[PDB]
Amino acid sequence: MIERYVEFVGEHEIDAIFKYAEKLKDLSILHVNSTAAGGGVAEILHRLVPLMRELGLNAEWKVIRGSQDFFTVTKSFHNALQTGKGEIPDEYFKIYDEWQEINAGEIPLDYDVVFIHDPQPAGLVKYRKKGTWIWRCHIDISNPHPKVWGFLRGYISKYDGMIVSIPEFARDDLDIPQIAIPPSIDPLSPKNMPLPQTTVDRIVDKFGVDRERPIILQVSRYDRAKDPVGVIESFRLAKRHVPDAQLVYLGSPDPEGEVVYRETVEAARGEKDVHLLMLPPNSHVEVNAFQRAATVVMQKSIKEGFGLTVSEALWKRKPVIGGNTGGIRIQVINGVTGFLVDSPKAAAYYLVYLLKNKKVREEMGEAGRDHVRRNFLITQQLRRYLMAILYLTKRH
Structure with missing residues (x-):
């Protein structure tokens, strides 16, 4: 209403x-x-x-x-x-x-x-x-x-x-x-509404993710445009400097897409702490819970008209590392609501920066929520x- x-x-x-x-x-x-x-x-x-x-x-x-x-x-x-x-x-x-x-x-x-x-x-x-x-x-x-x-x-x-x-x-x-x-974003939709800690805890545990350790989350399809392979590469570079960090790729099930998922499992091979999730469509509450459990959110798109997942993350006070393309650029204000990046290497650099600087993370999260309130x-x-x-x- x-x-x-x-x-x-x-x-x-x-x-x-x-x-x-x-x-x-x-x-x-x-x-x-x-x-x-x-x-x-x-x-x-x-x-x-x-x-x-x-x-x-x-x-x-x-x-x-x-x-x-x-x-x-x-x-x-x-x-x-x-x-x-x-x-x-x-x-x-x-x-x-x-x-x-x-x-x-x-x-x-x-x-x-x-x-x-x-x-x-x-x-x-x-x-x-x-x-x-x-x-x-x-x-x-x-x-x-x-x-x-x-x-x-x-x-x-x-x-x-x-x-x-x-x-x-x-x-x-x-x-x-x-x-x-x-x-x-609709701030009162199931995707964006406040959740009780009990619900977040319950959904994150259901997929074997550890709530006691940092979570890096991308919500997106296993499409080349979302670059799941690059996100795994960014994560493996960062993992050298943040050994406790976990990666969650939260996707939805095209024959090109089945190959992307395939390449992602392959690029992920040798990392226990990579979770490639495959949720049914309309799993809005599960996406909500993962976005609230995240320490840092990525949307490392190669092309993106807008990327609602960015505004969703900023609304829940999460800094976003965004691909320097399309409508990501109006949502991610560099150094303020997140970082815009052109490569897996630069993504990795900013993952490590944000995971090691808690006060900066929390402050970018507040700036993130304020930017969405005024604009999105x-x-x-x-x-x-x-x-x-x-x-x-x-x-x-």
């Missing part, structure tokens, strides 16, 4: 939210993405859409369907757009388009406002009627594979507006409005989302 947020952000932001929502009460809003389970987008929508309806907005959230072929194509597009690299068969474009049509027939699109999340449903804009169409981009499109980008830009050019996570993802080759809105709580994202709808629907 919106009132419960006053203790975090204060009445001014809450009154402004209600004021904006008053001007939108008569609009029908559709959100579309490609998954209702796990990932940053699903986790935002699961908290953001219910808050919209409580404000009395008519907001609906539909998820596309696809074959396993379809998700091979979209995962190759994702990696292409973020890395700038890859070999894309022309067949991939055909499969994408087919599933846009299947999905258009099965999804009524007659809304005043349509939000399409990420590249997977971006092709639905070919079946647009009227209203205001907004492309919500959650990925790094600063330096994309030019063919996958050129194809996807075909569709993006047909939208009325576009939301990116940080301003650095705004494109020069697009002349539609491009609005920077950082994602956010759901109420901030909701206010800016309402402001964007109001702005773009008045241009039509």
